Swiss-Prot record, chain A:
The chain holds residues 3772 to 3819 of 4303 of the full protein. It is found in: Cell membrane; Cell projection, Cilium; Endoplasmic reticulum; Golgi apparatus. It comes from the Eukaryota. The LDL-receptor class A domain is atypical; the potential calcium-binding site is missing. Component of the heterotetrameric polycystin channel complex with PKD2; the tetramer contains one PKD1 chain and three PKD2 chains. Interacts with PKD2; the interaction is required for ciliary localization. Interacts with PKD2L1. Interacts with PRKX; involved in differentiation and controlled morphogenesis of the kidney. Interacts (via extracellular domain) with WNT3A, WNT4, WNT5A and WNT9B. Interacts with DVL1 and DVL2. Interacts with NPHP1 (via SH3 domain). Interacts with BBS1, BBS4, BBS5 and TTC8. Interacts with RGS7. This is Polycystin-1. It is linked to Polycystic kidney disease 1 with or without polycystic liver disease: An autosomal dominant disorder characterized by renal cysts, liver cysts and intracranial aneurysm. Clinical variability is due to differences in the rate of loss of glomerular filtration, the age of reaching end-stage renal disease and the occurrence of hypertension, symptomatic extrarenal cysts, and subarachnoid hemorrhage from intracranial 'berry' aneurysm. The lineage of its organism: Eukaryota, Metazoa, Chordata, Craniata, Vertebrata.
From Swiss-Prot, chain B:
Residues 28-246, 305-330, 398-409, 425-432 are extracellular. Phosphorylated. Phosphorylation is important for protein function; a mutant that lacks the N-terminal phosphorylation sites cannot complement a zebrafish pkd2-deficient mutant. PKD-mediated phosphorylation at the C-terminus regulates its function in the release of Ca(2+) stores from the endoplasmic reticulum. N-glycosylated. The four subunits in a tetramer probably differ in the extent of glycosylation; simultaneous glycosylation of all experimentally validated sites would probably create steric hindrance. Thus, glycosylation at Asn-83 is not compatible with glycosylation at Asn-106; only one of these two residues is glycosylated at a given time. Disulfide bonds join C109-C122. Detected in fetal and adult kidney. Detected at the thick ascending limb of the loop of Henle, at distal tubules, including the distal convoluted tubule and cortical collecting tubules, with weak staining of the collecting duct. Detected on placenta syncytiotrophoblasts (at protein level). Strongly expressed in ovary, fetal and adult kidney, testis, and small intestine. Not detected in peripheral leukocytes. Residues 410-424 dip into the membrane without crossing it. A motif (Selectivity filter) lies at residues 419-421. Forms a nonselective cation channel. Can function as a homotetrameric ion channel or can form heteromer with PKD1. Displays distinct function depending on its subcellular localization and regulation by its binding partners. In primary cilium functions as a cation channel, with a preference for monovalent cations over divalent cations that allows K(+), Na(+) and Ca(2+) influx, with low selectivity for Ca(2+). Involved in fluid-flow mechanosensation by the primary cilium in renal epithelium. In the endoplasmic reticulum, likely functions as a K(+) channel to facilitate Ca(2+) release. Residues 268-283, 352-375 are cytoplasmic. Homotetramer. Component of the heterotetrameric polycystin channel complex with PKD1; the tetramer contains one PKD1 chain and three PKD2 chains. Isoform 1 interacts with PKD1 while isoform 3 does not. Interacts with PKD1L1; probably forms a Ca(2+) channel. Interacts with CD2AP. Interacts with HAX1. Interacts with NEK8. Part of a complex containing AKAP5, ADCY5, ADCY6 and PDE4C. Interacts (via C-terminus) with TRPV4 (via C-terminus). Glycans are attached at N83, N106, N140, N153. It comes from the Eukaryota. Changing K466A: Abolishes increased channel activity due to a gain of function mutation. This is Polycystin-2.
Length: 48, 476
């Protein structure tokens, strides 16, 4: 029971981007250094 | 020599056979088959109601399906939530079902002119040109208005009865068991499958959220023009979420290795037939390799094309407010099953192609039937000794060990000792003499003298097989 992944910005609390970027930005993955390969998923260096 | 012409081709053929066997073993769906069997048992064997005796496999009247839809089909499928879809709280159905009815048009036949005063009309069998398209009875919406075959994601199939196309009335279920039952009752009260009908069908999906297996289940019913109807069901386990964990990685690696081996074999066998003796077909050795290569390539391509897109399941899971067009996916899964049967046949053909050293097929049965006799003779001595020791242990350690308590348990205890699961804590404590003696003598007579006799028998059998082959095959 899993789906996609979020990629957008959200303010304090959760989604309400008012002025510029969300105060909890996405912080796109680094070029090199990721792939943790979890129990039954494969992630990268990106995330809030 | 015999190092490049007699040590490589046979080894390569054996490796190819091993790869084919591995690929065939990595294609047996156990959980999907069990889920399909459970769904069929809860559906095909489901009667109409508690008092009625109209089941799916006993279709004998037009009210059998109507009485079946409200009853056991509402208990094994339309179970209330804790309205979800979980009968035993473990069979989670996917999405919602849909119903289709390919009926004969109003006036699908003609009555004789000589008997036009008493004969009105008739209905033909289900077909592309014998499917109703105009309204049939009170058609407020799509409940009695047939949908186009191209506009309703339908096509001809030409199954066991007829080629029922996508034409016919269509309807969608609801998201609640009570609402589905009410809709079924409303459809049964009105003329939905009238006397001018030819075939009916229903399609649902099953997810079983606890298990990663999303399959489709399609029930069908062939209403013949000579009265009555014959129902049936079919389950298609079509999935495209194979890449999960290390098992999926191993399967993918095996598939890639098989593809590379097939490519290498094609490269190695495409040069000695072009710049060499060509048109060799009735040779039993040159056409077979080409046929095997072509069949392997075609099967690999078909398997790859079957999983060209995997967006159908993702789209169904993201939005499950209707019944998706899973008929095409079910047809693709049926074609994949046919391809799997063809691949089993191709594995048999590869085994035949591994029989290049022939004449050793039925001249050795007399020796195998003697080895079997020797093994049967040995099994009597082994079991006599085993039960003697078991009786000794049960009489001595009977009342004080909790392991040699019952006779049916002493046998399992001794088997576990043989496999190497000895305790030896109570055995010595329960009796300091005849406790160590029993264990020591048992080990000595079961691992040094009686287990080495089983190997010697087979050693002699192998030696005599080698001797008689190297005698007769190499003498004449």
């Amino acid at each position: 029971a899993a789906g996609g992944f979020s990629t957008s910005d959200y303010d304090v609390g959760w989604e309400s981007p008012h002025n510029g970027s969300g105060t909890w930005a996405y912080s796109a993955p680094d070029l090199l250094g990721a792939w943790s390969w979890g129990s039954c998923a494969v992630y990268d260096s990106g995330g809030y | 020599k015999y190092l490049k012409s007699v040590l490589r081709e046979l080894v390569t053929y054996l490796l190819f056979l091993i790869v084919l066997c591995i690929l065939t073993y990595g294609m047996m769906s156990s959980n999907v088959y069990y889920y399909t069997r459970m769904m069929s048992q809860l559906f095909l064997d489901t009667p109409v109601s508690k008092t009625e005796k109209t089941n799916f496999k006993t279709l004998s009247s037009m009210e059998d399906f109507w009485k079946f839809t409200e009853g056991s089909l509402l208990d094994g499928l339309y179970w209330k939530m804790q309205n979800r879809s979980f009968i035993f709280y473990e069979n989670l159905l996917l999405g919602v079902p849909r119903i289709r009815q390919l009926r004969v048009r109003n006036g699908s036949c003609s009555i004789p002119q000589d008997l036009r005063d008493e004969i009105k009309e008739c209905y033909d069998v289900y077909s592309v040109s014998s499917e109703d398209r105009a309204p049939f009875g009170p058609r407020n919406g799509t409940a009695w208005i047939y949908t186009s075959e191209k506009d309703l994601n339908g096509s001809s199939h030409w199954g066991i009865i007829a080629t029922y196309s996508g034409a016919g009335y269509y309807l969608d279920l609801s998201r609640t068991r009570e609402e589905t039952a009410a809709q079924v009752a409303s459809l049964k009260k009105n003329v939905w499958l009238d006397r001018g009908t030819r075939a009916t069908f229903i399609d649902f999906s099953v997810y079983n959220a606890n298990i990663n297996l999303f399959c489709v289940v399609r029930l069908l019913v062939e209403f013949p023009a000579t009265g009555g109807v014959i129902p049936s069901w079919q389950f298609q386990p079509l999935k495209l979420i194979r890449y999960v964990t290390t098992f999926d990685f191993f399967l993918a690696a095996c598939e890639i290795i098989f593809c590379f081996f097939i490519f290498y074999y094609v490269v190695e066998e495409i040069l000695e037939i072009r710049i060499h003796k060509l048109h060799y077909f009735r040779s039993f050795w040159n056409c077979l390799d080409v046929v095997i290569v072509v069949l392997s390539v075609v099967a690999i391509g078909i398997n790859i094309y079957r999983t060209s897109n995997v967006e159908v399941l993702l789209q169904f899971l993201e939005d499950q407010n209707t019944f998706p067009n899973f008929e095409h996916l079910a047809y693709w899964q049926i074609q994949f099953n046919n391809i799997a049967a063809v691949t089993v046949f191709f594995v048999w053909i590869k085994l035949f192609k591994f029989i290049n050293f022939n004449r050793t097929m039925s001249q050795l049965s007399t020796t195998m039937s003697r080895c079997a006799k020797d093994l049967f003779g040995f099994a009597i001595m082994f079991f006599i000794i085993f039960l003697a020791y078991a009786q000794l242990a049960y009489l001595v350690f009977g009342t004080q060990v909790d392991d040699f308590s019952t006779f049916q348990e002493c046998i399992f205890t001794q088997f576990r000792i043989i496999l190497g699961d000895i305790n030896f804590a109570e055995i010595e404590e329960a009796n300091r003499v005849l406790g160590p003696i029993y264990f020591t003598t048992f080990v000595f007579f079961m691992f040094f003298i009686l287990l080495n006799m089983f190997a010697a028998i087979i050693a002699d059998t192998y030696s005599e097989v080698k001797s008689d082959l190297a005698q007769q095959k190499a003498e004449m």
